[PDB]
Amino acid sequence: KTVVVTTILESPYVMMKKNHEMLEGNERYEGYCVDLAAEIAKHCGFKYKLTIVGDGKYGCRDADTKIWNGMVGELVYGKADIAIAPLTITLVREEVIDFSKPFMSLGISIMIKKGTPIESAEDLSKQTEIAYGTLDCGSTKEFFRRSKIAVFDKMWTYMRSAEPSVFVRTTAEGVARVRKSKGKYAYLLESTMNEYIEQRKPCDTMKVGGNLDSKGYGIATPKGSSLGNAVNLAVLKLNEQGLLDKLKNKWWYDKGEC
Amino acid sequence: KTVVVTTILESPYVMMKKNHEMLEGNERYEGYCVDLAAEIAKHCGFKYKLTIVGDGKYGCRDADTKIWNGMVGELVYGKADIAIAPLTITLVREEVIDFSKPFMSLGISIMIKKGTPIESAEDLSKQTEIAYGTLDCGSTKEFFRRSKIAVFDKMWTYMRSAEPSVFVRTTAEGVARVRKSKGKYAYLLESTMNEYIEQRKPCDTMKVGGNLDSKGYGIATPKGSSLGNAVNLAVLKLNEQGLLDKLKNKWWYDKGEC
Ligand SMILES: N[C@@H](CCC(=O)O)C(=O)O
Ligand SMILES: N[C@@H](CCC(=O)O)C(=O)O
Ligand SMILES: [Zn+2]
Ligand SMILES: [Zn+2]
Ligand SMILES: [Zn+2]
Ligand SMILES: [Zn+2]
């Protein structure tokens, strides 16, 4: 009856409200995906409960066991009915879960500490002084692992063998490593996150170069779920009425600190 | 057996080749969607015939008869098996046909003759010396018809009543109208088309302002078609392999003249 919605604590998509300890249920959280969940539910006519993914991951498949983890795993194994999160539409995921048409367009981008002498992925690939990595267990890592493009495969070959590990567990971890490393670590992450952090104090990062690829986030449901059709129409309706653009301005720019 | 593909003459998606008259069947055409059709057919394992939509339109629904025309109508009434074209994914279309995940991202943009005193949509709406319109029977017109945004609804109010008509039957006619109007006509069209034309002789137009919205083109199939699933997985594969980006540079930027 009540739809279980899996999501992930990733700013500004879903964040704990300042006073969450005094609030209950869905009211504990705020953010772009919290706002969007409320609208999808109202347009599709269901009640829902927001739940934070237990392992804190977006999702990947273990090479050995073939088991899915993260939000993808929660849908695949029946622990949640829908995921409303910055979850990237990819071929390997569409093979095991369903996605709506995208609600946000984005691409992989580079985050540097201001003043770092890097302007592009080609620049990162041609040097060794500045380290760089991506989030573990997400679509960005898979992009580099799978790429046949020479620049990106060169980047992958470095990243997969760098020690200590250049991969991080959360976006926040990646941004902190950029901020604390004096220009000697650059972080590869989606343009949406990069753009958001660029407007947050202490205003010491910047996005550089163009996007490396072009993709989308979608609302995900278990394969053949009865909800997929209505959720897809809801995303299209809300895009056409300007809601998605209005939400992006609210959470990225209206609140910008830089 | 042979899959009938509906498409539309729209540069640089589908164009007649230089020496088409000595060529036959699919070989008569070239462009981004021609290459894309060949890739999709190779991955999905079918043979196909390209056919240009009889009425030269993308597709809209007649408000009195409720009959669909254009490429959307060819799908709806069973005259074609698949549409491979710059066809915009929209709510009202998703109600009668199926769409793949998008193969290209885009937005509505403004095209002016160079030197025209217009910088934005708000600029057009606050004056009257320069007329402006959109393509008939497409998603851009409908966007303005349905817009609740003050600047956009106001534009629509002007466009719908304008005399003589500011709407055009083809993109080519819109561009020609901009070029021959001495700065007194501006054209609202998708950013993909705008960006292509800006790079072609006689280099007298320019895209101005940001995109007015964000959406995508998809490969469309009749509702419940056997083809839909494979076609969707194929578009995702092609994007991940970087082929879509390669095609984009081949047809937009390697082909610039200005
Ligand atoms: N949006 C990504 C997570 C972030 C990233 O990989 O950079 C995913 O769905 O895996
Ligand atoms: N891509 C549009 C046609 C061009 C336009 O409306 O600007 C459609 O599918 O309707
Ligand atoms: Zn807390
Ligand atoms: Zn609403
Ligand atoms: Zn001829
Ligand atoms: Zn191929």
UniProtKB/Swiss-Prot annotation, chains A, B:
Stated consequence of mutating residue 239 to D: Increases rate of desensitization
Q: Where is this site: Crucial to convey clamshell closure to channel opening?
A: 118
The keyword Phosphoprotein is annotated on this UniProt entry: yes
Organism of this sequence: Rattus norvegicus
Q: Where does L-glutamate bind?
A: 86, 88, 93, 139-140, 190
The cysteines covalently paired via disulfide bonds are 203-258
Supply the alphabetized keyword list: Cell membrane, Disulfide bond, Glycoprotein, Ion channel, Ion transport, Ligand-gated ion channel, Lipoprotein, Membrane, Palmitate, Phosphoprotein, Postsynaptic cell membrane, Receptor, Signal, Synapse, Transmembrane, Transmembrane helix, Transport, Ubl conjugation
| Sites of Phosphoserine modification | 147, 181
This entry's Gene Ontology molecular function terms read:
AMPA glutamate receptor activity; amyloid-beta binding; cytoskeletal protein binding; extracellular ligand-gated monoatomic ion channel activity; extracellularly glutamate-gated ion channel activity; glutamate receptor binding; glutamate-gated calcium ion channel activity; glutamate-gated receptor activity
Record PTM: Palmitoylated. Depalmitoylated upon L-glutamate stimulation. Ubiquitinated by RNF167, leading to its degradation.
Q: What does the subunit comment say?
A: Homotetramer or heterotetramer of pore-forming glutamate receptor subunits. Tetramers may be formed by the dimerization of dimers. May interact with MPP4. Forms a ternary complex with GRIP1 and CSPG4. Interacts with ATAD1 in an ATP-dependent manner. ATAD1-catalyzed ATP hydrolysis disrupts binding to ATAD1 and to GRIP1 and leads to AMPAR complex disassembly. Interacts with GRIP2. Interacts with GRIP1. Interacts with NSF via its C-terminus. Interacts with CACNG2, PICK1 and GRIP2. Interacts with GRIA1 and SYNDIG1. Part of a complex containing GRIA2, NSF and NAPA and/or NAPB.
Assigned protein family: Belongs to the glutamate-gated ion channel (TC 1.A.10.1) family. GRIA2 subfamily.
Please give the function described in this protein's UniProt entry.
Ionotropic glutamate receptor that functions as a ligand-gated cation channel, gated by L-glutamate and glutamatergic agonists such as alpha-amino-3-hydroxy-5-methyl-4-isoxazolepropionic acid (AMPA), quisqualic acid, and kainic acid. L-glutamate acts as an excitatory neurotransmitter at many synapses in the central nervous system and plays an important role in fast excitatory synaptic transmission.
**Protein's recorded name:** Glutamate receptor 2
Q: Further notes on this entry? A: The postsynaptic actions of L-glutamate are mediated by a variety of receptors that are named according to their selective agonists. This receptor binds AMPA (quisqualate) > L-glutamate > kainate.
